[PDB]
Structures are given as structure tokens and as C-alpha cells.
Amino acid sequence: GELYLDCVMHDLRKMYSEIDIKVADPVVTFCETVVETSSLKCFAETPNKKNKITMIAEPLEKGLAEDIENEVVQITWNRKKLGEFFQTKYDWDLLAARSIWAFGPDATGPNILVDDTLPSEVDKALLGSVKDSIVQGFQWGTREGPLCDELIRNVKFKILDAVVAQEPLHRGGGQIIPTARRVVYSAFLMATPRL
Amino acid sequence: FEPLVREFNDINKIIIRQPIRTEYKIAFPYLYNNLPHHVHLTWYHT
Numbered sequence: 001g002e003l004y005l006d007c008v009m010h011d012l013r014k015m016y017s018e019i020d021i022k023v024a025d026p027v028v029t030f031c032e033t034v035v036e037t038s039s040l041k042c043f044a045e046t047p048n049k050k051n052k053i054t055m056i057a058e059p060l061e062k063g064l065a066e067d068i069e070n071e072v073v074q075i076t077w078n079r080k081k082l083g084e085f086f087q088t089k090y091d092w093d094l095l096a097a098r099s100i101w102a103f104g105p106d107a108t109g110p111n112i113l114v115d116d117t118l119p120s121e122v123d124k125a126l127l128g129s130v131k132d133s134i135v136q137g138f139q140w141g142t143r144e145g146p147l148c149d150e151l152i153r154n155v156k157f158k159i160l161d162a163v164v165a166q167e168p169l170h171r172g173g174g175q176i177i178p179t180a181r182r183v184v185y186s187a188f189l190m191a192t193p194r195l
Numbered sequence: 196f197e198p199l200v201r202e203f204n205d206i207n208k209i210i211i212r213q214p215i216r217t218e219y220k221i222a223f224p225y226l227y228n229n230l231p232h233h234v235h236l237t238w239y240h241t
Contacts, residue, residue, distance in 0.1 A: 002223055009225040020230050022203055027210060 030195055032147060032188075034059050034155040039191035041160070044182050046175040050168065051130070053179055054117075054161035057187040064090060065110045065154045068103065075100065102135040105143035110153040113138055117160050127162050133173035134159075137180025146185050147193065157187055199233065 009023070038056035045052050067073050067089070075082055083097030096116055104111035113135070121127060142152050164172060219227045224234045 002226065006223040006226040013225065013231075022229050023226070024204055025209055025211075025215070 030148070030150045031153045032145065032150055032155075033153050033194045034188065034192050035194055036192045038187060042183065042186035042190060043161070043163075044179060044186060046171075046179055048171065048175070050165045050171050051176055051179060052161070052163040053134070053159065053176070053183045054163075055157055055159050055183045055187040057191070058156050058158065059154055060112050060156040061090070062154070064112070068108055068112070069110065071108050074108065075103070101131060102138055104139060105151055106139075109139070109142065110151070110155075111138075111142050112156050114156060114158040115162075116158065117162065120161060123162070126164055126166070130162075130164055130168075130172045130176045133176045134180045136173075137177040138184060140177075141181035141184040144181070146189055147195075152188065155188065157184060200230075 005026070009021075013019075013021070034057050037058040041054055041056050043052050043054045064073070073082070073085060073089075079098050079100075082100070083092070083094065086092035086097050087094065095118065096114055099115040099121075101113040101115060103109045103113070115121060138157070145151060164176070168175075215227065222237065222239070224231050224236075
């Protein structure tokens with residue numbers, strides 16, 4: 001607050017650095033959000049056309065995000081227990097209850113990552129190998145910030161088609177991390193960004 | 196009284212949301228001015 005920064009600027013000047021300091025007018029930190037389901041989805045690949053990622057975005061409810069901020073909906077327990085908590089608190093679907101991948105910009109973040117591509121996610125041996133690179137791109141791109149490098153609050157990202165080439169073994173992870181980043185940017189920016 | 200002393204603050208990069216009312220420089224002297232020399236602190240609440 002005001003008196004806190006007044007006290008630390010007094011401390012800075014009078015105790016450690018005697019230097020005159022130009023100080024601008026204070027601004028606050030801002031955030032970002034999405035308020036509606038996504039449009040015709042963008043799928044994007046690497047410079048070498050190898051691996052695609054299909055993602056839509058729609059807002060998880062206020063209660064969902066505020067309870068993830070209060071750690072009660074943490075994925076650290078059994079996936080079945082997490083799914084049962086989703087079912088007993090938010091009428092959540094069972095097929096969507098046991099497919100959630102990660103959270104976002106920290107250990108408890110205001111985003112959520114869901115998979116529902118039931119005929120095409122029988123390709124699990126080739127999905128789960130790059131699923132962790134999707135998480136490594138997901139958390140990093142959600143703590144980056146598209147517009148003015150702020151944080152992204154209360155947005156659900158949902159992957160609907162995973163087209164990954166057979167045995168990448170060096171291409172997959174390292175190339176899908178910027179793909180996860182760029183498809184996260186597309187699914188965010190396309191069909192209702194808000195501040 | 197009489198004066199005792201006698202690309203950062205760009206006007207396109209600073210939101211003027213509230214006009215800075217001048218008594219802020221009294222109430223919080225370090226946070227609202229540059230070069231606060233020979234300044235006195237204030238007792239602010241009983």
C-alpha cells in the first residue's frame with residue numbers, strides 16, 4: 001500500500017542508497033480473462049510439420065477458480081478423488097473428471113486443462129509422452145501473458161484433437177512446448193479476451 | 196513561503212486517473228516528490 005512504499009522509499013534513501021531517485025506515478029498490476037466459449041478453433045504446428053494441437057477455451061466458473069485458489073481442488077491426490085470432488089461440488093462430467101492435466105502459472109493457478117477426444121485419445125502411448133511437454137508449455141505460457149505480459153485468470157483450456165507423429169524421440173517434447181505455448185495464445189486471443 | 200532550493204516520466208506512458216492532489220506530497224513525502232531534502236516526518240493519527 002501507500003504507507004508501505006513510502007516507508008521503503010524512505011528506508012532506501014536514508015539507510016542504504018543516498019542517491020536521488022526519479023519515481024513515477026504508481027500503477028497496479030492487471031490480469032486477463034475469457035468470458036465465453038471459443039470460436040472455430042485454431043490448430044498450429046512447428047516449422048517442421050510434425051505435430052498438431054487442437055484447443056478451445058471456455059470459462060470455468062467463479063467458484064471453480066476461487067476454490068482452486070483455496071487449494072481444495074488440488075490434483076495431488078488420486079485422480080478418482082479429484083473427480084469425485086468435481087462431481088460432488090460442480091455437477092462435473094465423469095469422462096471429464098478423470099482427464100484433467102494441470103493447473104497453470106504456479107502450483108495453484110487460475111486456469112485448468114481438460115482433455116475430451118474420446119475416439120482419438122485411445123492413442124495414449126503417443127499422447128502421454130508429449131502430455132508433459134504440453135504441461136511444461138502450458139504453465140509457462142500462462143505465466144507469460146499475451147497482451148502486456150500479465151497473468152491469465154479464470155480460463156478453461158480444453159484439447160479436442162492430438163495429432164502427433166509416430167516415434168518423434170527428439171522432436172516431440174522440445175517442439176511441442178512452443179506449440180503448446182502458441183496454441184494457448186491462439187485459444188486465448190481468438191474469441192473473448194478481457195482485462 | 197520562499198523556495199529553499201532556489202524517457203521515464205513520459206506523458207504518453209502515465210495514466211492520469213486521479214489528479215494528484217497536492218497534500219499527498221505532505222502526507223507521504225518520499226512517495227510523492229523527487230529529491231525530498233530537509234523533509235520532516237508527520238504524526239498522522241491519534
